[PDB]
């Protein structure tokens, strides 16, 4: 059937700067199962109705997946500002889709700490929507060159999370899946009645 079981029930999830994108086509999806799952903490669809919404032949669907903190879920929205919104992941002002997130504290936390997820802290400028940038340069703050060393006004432009199971609710891991219903001229085989 649809590859929705390979997206939501995957054992590995990516980081927020090197995030993943998957194309889903040639299947019929049962969207009513996802609506009445009663397991997701947030379910906010933009542009489309919160109704049954089954018999709609969309052009293409993308599945993006990453792990962030629980105090940054409000930044995954159009017209928002922050560290995640400016440097890592950006949504346009005309977005048609839905944002699904749920707690994953029992899967992504260890006694001692988990340090396998990264985010970018310093950057010169912002980025366009749907833009991915991977780099390992040296961020120069002042005018004195660094020449690949960390001294004064020289910083390494990456930062890692630290996840423990005894943290507060705002510091716990959250697993985020974003679905985009792009509209384009196509036969539009993905209907799912």
């Amino acid at each position: 059937l649809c590859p929705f079981g390979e997206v939501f029930n995957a054992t590995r999830f990516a980081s927020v700067y090197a995030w993943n994108r998957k194309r889903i086509s040639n299947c019929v999806a049962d969207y009513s199962v996802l609506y009445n799952s009663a397991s997701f903490s947030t379910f906010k669809c933009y542009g489309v109705s919160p109704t049954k919404l089954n018999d709609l032949c969309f052009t293409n669907v993308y599945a993006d997946s990453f792990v962030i903190r629980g105090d940054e879920v409000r930044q995954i929205a159009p017209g928002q500002t922050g560290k995640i919104a400016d440097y890592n992941y950006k949504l346009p002002d005309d977005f048609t889709g839905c944002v699904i997130a749920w707690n994953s504290n029992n899967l992504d936390s260890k006694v001692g700490g988990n340090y396998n997820y990264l985010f970018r802290l310093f950057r010169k400028s912002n980025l366009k929507p749907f833009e991915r940038d991977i780099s390992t340069e040296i961020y120069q703050a002042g005018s004195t060159p660094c020449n690949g060393v960390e001294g004064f006004n020289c910083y390494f432009p990456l930062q890692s999370y630290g996840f423990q199971p005894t943290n507060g609710v705002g510091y716990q891991p959250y697993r985020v899946v974003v679905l985009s219903f792009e509209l384009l001229h196509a036969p539009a085989t993905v209907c799912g009645p």
Binding site: L121, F122, A141, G142, N153, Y155, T166, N167, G168, V169
Partner: protein, 595 residues
Amino acid sequence: STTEDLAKTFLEKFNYEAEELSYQNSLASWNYNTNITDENIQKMNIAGAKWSAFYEEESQHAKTYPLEEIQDPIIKRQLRALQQSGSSVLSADKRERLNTILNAMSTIYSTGKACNPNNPQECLLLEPGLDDIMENSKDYNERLWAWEGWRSEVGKQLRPLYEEYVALKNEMARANNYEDYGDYWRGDYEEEWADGYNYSRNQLIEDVEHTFTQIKPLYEHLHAYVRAKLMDAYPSRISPTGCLPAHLLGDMWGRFWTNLYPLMVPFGQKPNIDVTDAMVNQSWDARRIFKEAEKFFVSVGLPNMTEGFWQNSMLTEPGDNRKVVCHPTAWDLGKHDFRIKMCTKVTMDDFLTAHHEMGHIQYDMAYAAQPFLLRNGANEGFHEAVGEIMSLSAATPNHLKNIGLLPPDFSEDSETDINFLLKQALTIVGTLPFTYMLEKWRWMVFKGEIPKEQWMQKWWEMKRDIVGVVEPLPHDETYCDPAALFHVANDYSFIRYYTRTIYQFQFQEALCQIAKHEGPLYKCDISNSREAGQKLHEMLSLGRSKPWTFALERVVGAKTMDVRPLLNYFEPLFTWLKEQNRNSFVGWNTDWSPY
């Protein structure tokens, strides 16, 4: 690129690294206090030494940016907390000698013992053996050898070590553009870069001296009532017009007058209020105590506890092979992790202690959205003052009838209110001349007004004049009597216990007017009043973003401290004291001595 953008980029890197590194230090100290073994102390001292070496490397990074080129109040309050340095300005041979002197004074105090005259096989330590004599005995000659022997064996060994500690501390202060080490300690109350809310280090001396002269009529009527009741317990030993001997105050030093209550009770037939037996008959446990404290804060408008509070706290003794220190503390580990560790018993004293410790948690949950360097109270007296007023309303008899611990046909007695007010005055009023005299002697000795050949001469001149306490035996220039206290020998300041009492009654008098209370102030109960909970929450969520003169005006409506709310609380007691003192003498003279 200006220098303000260089100091702003520096603080966005410091916040993410100091938060993750201070959490590993706090988590490694929780596992030792709840499980005392040999392997836990090794992991405690390793993670506690990485935080001290990381912090001093960035204290030299912060001084690359001059403080006079920043025009932002948020940034400048964070840079001055990171640009401060201590003993790093000295040389290597001077800094190594300073830590040798400090460690040697702390081992004499914790391992010193005084032996018993006329029985030389009995030598007793301070905490298990010497505190029981001074707090429970009624013999005149038993309390005398336990008072002299502590100061002639322990205090005369710190005298040559304390003089070299003064000279090394006065060399560190003069290299940081201060005038002496006393001026160094008074900088905690200094406020700057404000328009109309400024405060100076010289202004603190004028504020303490002004408020002390207004409590002197109240302290004289309490001094006369104690002296006339101590002449029955120790007959033919106290002069009717004079001072009080130092070894008969119910304590080793005389800091509190609490243990003298059974020798002076106004109405000896009316009992006190004690609800420790109705809790046993209704089958109350340790979880019932902490659930009643949570319903108190909900009725005033404050939130509930989190889910991890009930799973990670230690509310009872484990009863296993583990060894746990039983001391009530509230822990803020960081990353929104709140715990309480105490060993709870079903009494009335543990009922009121749960309201005090939960008041510290409500303060910590309010400023959680502040930056990492600005998560504290307004100064060093604000944090304990919030917890004291929460335990003041829960002991009122109006509140105890509403929770079923008293029968509905309970009649208020006017003779049991005198009993409640005298016991409060022995703890609160009786310790205020003691704290004023301690800090005034240390400020002069750091400045040079008192030469080293006149140290003990000025110590007993201010006891007779300010406090009214006379020495039992004469001393000379080989003693060090202030060095027998815990805070002096461990390098702690003592002025935080004076200003905390004055702030306590200013908050209580203001909140009982919003609640439309009718009657005297000692019967006030702020429960089921949501208007009084919104006023207190506006001050608790500020942190250290604003000066402490700004945060005081949001609650009481004034910039500086005032002592007139404190004199209104003890106004029924003040009328009863003057009627009892109609055939006595108020005052003392400094010519009588026991020797």
